[PDB]
Q: What sequence folds into this?
């Protein structure tokens, strides 16, 4: 059951939000989330995530395992073209919207997305109007942000991306699985590569 796996995932995401003060500071968890009955859409990333979801902390393991169990049931998205990121990146990365205007659960109060990148990928400079708050669920990666330090983030660490500030991320030997909140002007916009 897709419905059961996604409902269990939503519970794990809510618990994760409640447990992270930076997430509580960024947005209140919505009281109106509704099952959307959005169908699954498979992309090649599923098998990479399932075989190699990344090291979890004891605190992040329930969410990581819920994400792996949800993988065959979510609507995976890519966003970028082969010209922009290359075929290997498209094979070994993807994202989906867990909650939000077009989430597996609908709400207009918040947007929650999830991304996976296998090892050895360089997600180049990209940007968008809405603010975003990353968390790492499992794995680790190096996070770049214009006008700010580089940070190597591990499970449970977070990073705020202010509106329109370009950011980027590199995985080295480990993959990374993330769960991200969005807010502000432009909510519902997708990232674009910086020009
Ligand atoms: Br809550
Ligand atoms: Br909920
Ligand atoms: Br509304
Ligand atoms: Br800073
Ligand atoms: Br707002
Ligand atoms: Ni398709
Ligand atoms: Zn972003």
A:
């Amino acid at each position: 059951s897709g419905r059961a796996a996604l409902t269990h995932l939503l519970e794990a995401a809510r618990d994760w939000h409640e447990a992270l003060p930076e997430f509580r500071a960024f947005a209140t968890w919505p009281e109106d989330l509704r099952w959307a009955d959005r169908p699954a859409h498979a992309l090649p990333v599923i098998d990479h995530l399932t075989r190699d979801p990344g090291h979890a902390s004891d605190q992040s393991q329930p969410l990581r395992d819920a994400l792996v169990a949800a993988a065959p049931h979510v609507e995976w998205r890519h966003s970028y073209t082969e010209a922009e990121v290359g075929r290997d990146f498209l094979n070994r990365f993807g994202w989906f919207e867990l909650a939000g205007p077009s989430g597996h659960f609908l709400t207009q109060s918040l947007r929650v997305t999830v991304g996976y990148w296998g090892p050895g990928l360089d997600y180049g400079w990209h940007e968008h109007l809405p603010e975003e708050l990353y968390s790492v669920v499992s794995g680790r990666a190096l996070f770049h942000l214009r006008n700010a330090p580089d940070l190597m983030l591990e499970p449970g660490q977070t990073r705020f991306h202010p509106a329109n500030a370009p950011h980027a991320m590199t995985t080295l030997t480990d993959p990374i699985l993330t769960l991200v909140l969005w807010r502000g002007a432009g909510l519902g916009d997708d990232p674009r590569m910086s020009q």
Remarks:
- The longest strand covers residues 131-139.
- The helical segments are 2-19, 21-26, 45-51, 61-70, 82-85, 87-92.
- The chain has one domain: 1-195.
- DSSP finds six helices and twelve strands in the chain.
